[PDB]
Amino acid sequence: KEHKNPLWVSPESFKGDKNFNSDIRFAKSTTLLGTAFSGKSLTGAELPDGYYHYVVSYYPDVVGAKRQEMTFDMILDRQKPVLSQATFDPETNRFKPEPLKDRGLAGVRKDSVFYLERKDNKPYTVTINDSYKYVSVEDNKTFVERQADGSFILPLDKAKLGDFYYMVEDFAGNVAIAKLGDHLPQTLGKTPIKLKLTDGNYQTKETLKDNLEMTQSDTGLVTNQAQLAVVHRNQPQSQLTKMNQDFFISPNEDGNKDFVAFKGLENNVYNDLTVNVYAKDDHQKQTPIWSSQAGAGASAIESTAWYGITARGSKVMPGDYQYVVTYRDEHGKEHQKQYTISVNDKKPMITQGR
Ligand SMILES: [Ca+2]
């Protein structure tokens, strides 16, 4: 409560004018996305789920003025709500979950039940925005009203019983969805039944496609690759590629060569793996610009992916850097693999042709 021990501080500071808005061309508010907190601490470590204080602090531009702050209470919750049991009354079509309960602190914010209206013999919809050159896909979710006692009269008219989904959302955006498919072979019509729900582990993102199978003739470095668009503004399909040539990265999340990572031979042991990044002028490797966290493994690439950042979070300057890898095998000190990556985020210069 004293704000003495800070777990993270934004690397940039900001200064600006009052939102005085004398005419339209003067904004009435200012969004400062540089103050973004993503649950990672001052060294890149991940702070655990819990209660936090998100504190914004600033100074009037008057000398001798006390620093002002403003505190938002704020939860970290990475835990989906729980789906335990439900009751289905085949005599009313009445679907009634057990308790609403969340894992973590955010708490359950909403119950819902939906089936997928099949339209065009597909269950989703692709909408193309021809003016901003952007395509979006969205399910054809069609929902079932929630009665006041928290139950749902399932319209078995419109979708098979097992083709409904029960969805529970907590604040902070954890979602648990369960299709009613942990069912009973020949039980409708008869007595009410208690039904088991398990979250179907649906997701929004699916991470990079590995499929690489390292040889020893490889440096061990890997990076990403993606075909960068010319007209559209969707996110292109990116895949991993071995480096062993051209130790450079473009850290701009463009999809392409945005990070250096290390992957071991798939059957060698790298127990207690650590990646450190030092600068070109630190020829003794004392002071790391960036470091991996605990639990770094040579098979989880995100544990070793240096994205041209300092640990604190900000982007390194263009120039040469040292990416030093250390591990111990079935016998140890079989480490210190020294790569020298340079950065350069300047798009090249197309000269006119003949
Ligand atoms: Ca939760």
The 3-state secondary structure of the chain, one letter per residue: CCCCCCCCCCCCCCCCCCCCCCCCCCCCCCCCHHHCCCCECCCCCECCCEEEEEEEEECCCCCCCCCEEEEEEEEECCCCEECCEEEEECCCCEEEECCCEECCCCCEEEEEEEEECCECCECEEEEEECCCCEEEEEECEEECCCCCCCCEECCCCCCCHHHEEEEEEEHHHCEEEEECCCCCCCCCCCCCEEEECCCCCCCCCCCCECCCCCCCCCCCEEEEEECCCCCCCCCCCEEEEECCCCCECCCCCCCCCCCEEECCCCCCCCEEEEEEEEECCCCCCCCCCEECCCCCCCCCHHHCCECCECCCCCECCCCEEEEEEEEECCCCCCCCEEEEEECCCCCCCCCCCC
Examine the domain organization and report whether 252 and 343 are in the same domain: yes
| Whether residues 200 and 229 fall in one domain | no
Q: Is the dihedral of CA 294, 298, 301, 304 positive or negative?
A: positive
19 annotated as belonging to a binding site for a ligand: no
Please say whether the beta carbons of 106 and 174 come within 8 A.
yes
Closest to 247 in 3D by CA, of 219, 284, 288? 219
258 is in an annotated binding site: yes
Q: Do residues 196 and 233 both lie within one domain?
A: no
Tell whether 226 and 140 lie within a shared domain: no
Single-letter residue type at 348: P
User: Binding site annotation covers 102?
Assistant: yes
Give 169 Cα–ligand 1 centroid separation in angstroms. Answer: 8
Ligand 1 centroid to 8 CA: how many Å? 22
Instruction: Tell me if 49 sits within 8 A of 105, measured CB to CB.
Output: yes
In the block, which residue shows the tokens 């020829």? 283
299 annotated as a binding-site residue? no
Q: How far is the CA of 297 from the centre of ligand 1 (A)?
A: 28
For 142-151, which contacts have Cβ atoms below 8 Å and span 24 or more sequence positions? 142/114, 142/115, 142/116, 142/117, 143/112, 143/113, 143/114, 144/95, 144/112, 144/113, 144/114, 144/115, 146/111, 146/112, 146/113, 149/96, 150/96, 150/97, 150/100, 150/111, 151/94, 151/95, 151/96
Is 103 annotated in some ligand binding site? yes
The annotation status of 169 as a binding-site residue, yes or no, is: yes
177 Cα: distance to centroid of ligand 1 (angstroms): 13
The answer to whether the CB of 248 falls within 8 A of the CB of 260 is: no
Are 193 and 135 found together in one domain?
yes
Query: Looking at the structure, do residues 248 and 186 belong to the same domain, yes or no?
Result: no
- Residue 197 and residue 102 share a domain: yes
Residue 154 CA to ligand 1 centre (angstroms)? 26
The angle subtended at Cα 194 by Cα 191 and Cα 199, nearest 5°, is: 145
Resolution (A): 3.1
Sorted by sequence, the CB contacts under 8 Å of residue 296 that are 6+ apart come out as: 273, 274, 275, 303, 304
Separation of alpha carbons 222 and 244, rounded Å? 8
CB atoms within 10 A of CB 98: 13
221-226/101-102 β-pairing = unpaired
Rounded distance from Cα 291 to ligand 1 centre (Å): 30
- What are the angstrom distances between the C-alpha of 296 and each of 94, 251, 326, 338? 49, 21, 11, 17
**Is residue 322 within 8 Å of 282, Cβ to Cβ?**
yes
Sorted by sequence, the CB contacts under 8 Å of residue 267 that are 6+ apart come out as: none
Quick one: residue 173, left, alpha or beta (phi over 0 = left, psi -120 to 50 = alpha)? left
Residue 266 tokens read as 């798939």
| CA pair distance 179, 145, nearest whole angstrom | 17
Q: How far is the CA of 78 from the centre of ligand 1 (A)?
A: 6
215 with 343, same domain: the answer is: yes
Order of all β-strands in the sheet with 290-291: 290-291, 271-279, 320-328, 337-342
Closest CA to 241 of 223, 259, 219, 218: 223
- Structure determination method: X-ray
Phi (first) and psi of residue 136, to 5 degrees: -135, 140
Q: Is 254 annotated as a binding residue?
A: yes
Residue 336: exposure state from Cβ atoms within 10 A (0-12, 13-18, ≥19): exposed
Distance of alpha carbon 157 from alpha carbon 148, whole angstroms: 22
Does the annotation flag 17 for ligand binding?
no
The C-alpha atoms of residue 143 and residue 261 are separated, in whole angstroms, by 44
**C-alpha–C-alpha distance, residues 49 and 47, integer Å:** 7
Q: How far is CA 160 from CA 152, 174, 233, 301, in A?
A: 15, 27, 38, 42
Is 138 assigned to a binding site? no
Which tokens sit at 180?
């009613």
Asked whether residue 265 falls in the same domain as residue 287, the answer is yes
Are 105 and 138 contained in the same domain? yes
CA of 76 to the centre of ligand 1 (A): 9
Say how many Å lie between the CA of residue 108 and the centre of ligand 1: 7
- Binding residue per annotation — 252? yes
Q: What are phi and psi of 163, to 5 degrees?
A: -100, 10
Q: Is 302 exposed, middle or buried (0-12, 13-18, 19+ CB in 10 A)?
A: exposed
Structural domain boundaries enclosing 264: 211-347
d(CA 264, CA 163): 44
Residue whose entry in the numeric block shows the structure tokens 């399910």: 139
Q: Find the largest Cα–Cα distance for the chain.
A: 82
200 shares its domain with 87? yes
Q: Are residues 100 and 145 in the same domain?
A: yes
